[PDB]
Amino acid sequence: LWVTVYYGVPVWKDAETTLFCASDAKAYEKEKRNVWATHCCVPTDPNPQEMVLENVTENFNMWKNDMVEQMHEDVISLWDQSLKPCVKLTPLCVTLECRQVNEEIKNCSFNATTELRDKKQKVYALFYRLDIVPLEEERKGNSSKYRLINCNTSAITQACPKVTFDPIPIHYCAPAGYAILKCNNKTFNGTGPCNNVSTVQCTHGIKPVVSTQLLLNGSLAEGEIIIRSENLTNNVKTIIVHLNESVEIVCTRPNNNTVKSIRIGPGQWFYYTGDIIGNIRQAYCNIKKDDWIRTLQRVGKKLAEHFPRRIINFTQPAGGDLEITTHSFNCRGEFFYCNTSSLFNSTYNPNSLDITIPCRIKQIINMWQRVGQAMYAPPIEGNITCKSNITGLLLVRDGESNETEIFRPGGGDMRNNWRSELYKYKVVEIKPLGIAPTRCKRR
């Protein structure tokens, strides 16, 4: 009958705000530290509070979610800050001279600088052929002249050896006055209402992993395999697949790769691959065959359901640069690049052993397609081996065709990797002030 002002009303509006990162109290040991531990210095509450919203339906949209942009910018800024005070390898861009070691490796020699500006030191180093450009025609009579790649593009920064970029589970928490809504409904695709929602002050542990074709870590789907895509009919939109069971992959670099260090300037140290012990062998990845085949069969079934009356065809990635055609990832600082052609060689029907994937290695990197910047990854002694759980795939439908849909790996844009983890969440602002009628006058 009469207006009445209520304060503290439970109503929220869609909003955008600068979330702050929070991690476990023992994020990392302070001796060597980590970029994710030096950042995210906010202890998290164990077993975060979860207030399930009874009989509440809310609209979600994993795409057009600002949390993805915030995480992307946070990762970029953190990497830039970490690489800012490290050594500049601008002095090393000189005319390199290289010969055979005894195809990928080359025994390059050059005149590097010293702490004294009037002196130079002869340096012998094993550089990968990918990181070295054929300055001459590469006739290879006896030797030939080269340069470091990207030297004409931009200066090269050494990654600090004392700091490690290994991912750790980090939690995003909303500031005061805002809340994060988590859609707990199984088999819910983005861009639609969700019936099982809950309120949390912080997200679950998210591992900021870098990869191009396979999501090497993260959370498995609750129920069955789930397909997600902005349109699913426009062939430009990338398709994301969440697996409800992991697929083991073990990757290694079977070389000794002895490490040596020299001083190129006052307080400036530079690390290189020196020499090797034992045979030259290519890096490779072993992935379980039966599990991979079953997972591809199930994914083919799901795509056939979403694309009826077609043949789901999995094809190797189209030809192109190594940065866009290979499965990239980062094991202990070494940057791998795997062909993975053999993994996508199967056709689904609409009517003990391991797969060994050859992989190359690069030291000079251009991350996130930031033309005008680069970094140098120093080597590590001993043979490296790492293990990971392939939890998802990134597929690009080619989109004319003889009853066939062509799915290829791709989606090199890094926002997709974090959207695959942040699809559940939405940030909202609380508007506590509210008005309703009642049966009483103010007098």
Partner 1 sequence: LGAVSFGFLGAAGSTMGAASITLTVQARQLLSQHLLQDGHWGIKQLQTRVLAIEHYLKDQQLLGIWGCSGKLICCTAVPWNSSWSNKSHDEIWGNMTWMQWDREISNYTNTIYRLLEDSQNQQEQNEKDLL
Ligand X SMILES: *[C@@H]1O[C@H](CO)[C@@H](O[C@@H]2O[C@H](CO)[C@@H](O)[C@H](O)[C@H]2NC(C)=O)[C@H](O)[C@H]1NC(C)=O
Ligand Y SMILES: *[C@@H]1O[C@H](CO)[C@@H](O[C@@H]2O[C@H](CO)[C@@H](O[C@@H]3O[C@H](CO[C@H]4O[C@H](CO)[C@@H](O)[C@H](O)[C@@H]4O)[C@@H](O)[C@H](O[C@H]4O[C@H](CO)[C@@H](O)[C@H](O)[C@@H]4O)[C@@H]3O)[C@H](O)[C@H]2NC(C)=O)[C@H](O)[C@H]1NC(C)=O
Mapped onto helix, strand or coil, the DSSP state of residue 374 is coil
Residue 33 binding its own copies, by CB under 8 A: no
Q: What residues contact 215, with CB distance under 8 A and at least 6 apart?
A: 209, 390, 391, 392, 393, 394, 417, 420
CA distance linking residue 235 with residue 386, whole number of Å:
34
CB of 398 to partner 1, least distance (A): 34
Nearest to residue 68, comparing CAs of 382, 421, 326?
421
Nearest to residue 178, comparing CAs of 429, 9, 8?
429
Residue 330 binding result from its own copies, ligand Y, ligand NAG, none, given CB thresholds of 5 to 8 Å by partner type: ligand Y
Q: Residues 378-407: x/- map of binding to ligand X (CB under 6 A)?
A: ------------------------------
Q: Residues 140-179: x/- map of binding to its own copies (CB under 8 A)?
A: -------x--xxxxxxx-----------------------
Given a contact cutoff of 8 angstroms between Cβ atoms, the answer to whether 210 and 329 are in contact is yes
327-330-335-338 Cα dihedral, nearest 10 degrees: -20
3-class SS string, 148-175:
ECCCCCCCCEECCCCCECCCCCEEEECC
Within 230-249, which residues bind ligand X (CB under 6 A)? Answer: 232
Among 39, 145, 204, 360, the residue binding partner 1 under the rule CB under 8 A is 39
Q: Which two tokens stand for residue 428?
A: 């909202």
Nearest to residue 35, comparing CAs of 158, 168, 157?
168
Q: Residues in contact with ligand X, total (CB under 6 A)? A: 11
CA distance linking residue 304 with residue 313, whole number of Å:
10
Residue 26 binding result from its own copies, partner 1, ligand NAG, none, given CB thresholds of 5 to 8 Å by partner type: none
Q: Residues 379-418: x/- map of binding to ligand Y (CB under 6 A)?
A: ------xxxx------------------------------
Within 371-430, which residues bind partner 1 (CB under 8 A)? Answer: 430
Residue 30 binding ligand Y, by CB under 6 A: no
Given a contact cutoff of 8 angstroms between Cβ atoms, the answer to whether 251 and 213 are in contact is no
Given a contact cutoff of 8 angstroms between Cβ atoms, the answer to whether 154 and 302 are in contact is no
Within 194-223, which residues bind ligand Y (CB under 6 A)? Answer: 209, 216-217
Residue 330 binding ligand Y, by CB under 6 A: yes
- DSSP β-bridge partners for residue 263: 269
Stretch of residues binding ligand Y (CB under 6 A), selected from 100-108, 147-155, 191-199, 327-335: 327-335
Helical H segments across 307-389, by residue range: 322-325
Q: Which residues bind ligand Y (CB under 6 A)?
A: 33-34, 164, 166-167, 209, 216-217, 329-333, 385-388
Q: Which residues bind partner 1 (CB under 8 A)?
A: 1-12, 17-18, 20, 38-39, 41-43, 49, 51, 53-57, 77, 81, 174-177, 179-180, 199-201, 430-443
Q: Which residues bind ligand X (CB under 6 A)?
A: 189, 191-192, 229, 232, 316, 319, 325-326, 339, 341
Q: Which residues bind its own copies (CB under 8 A)?
A: 90-91, 93-95, 111, 115-119, 147, 150-156, 263, 265-267, 372
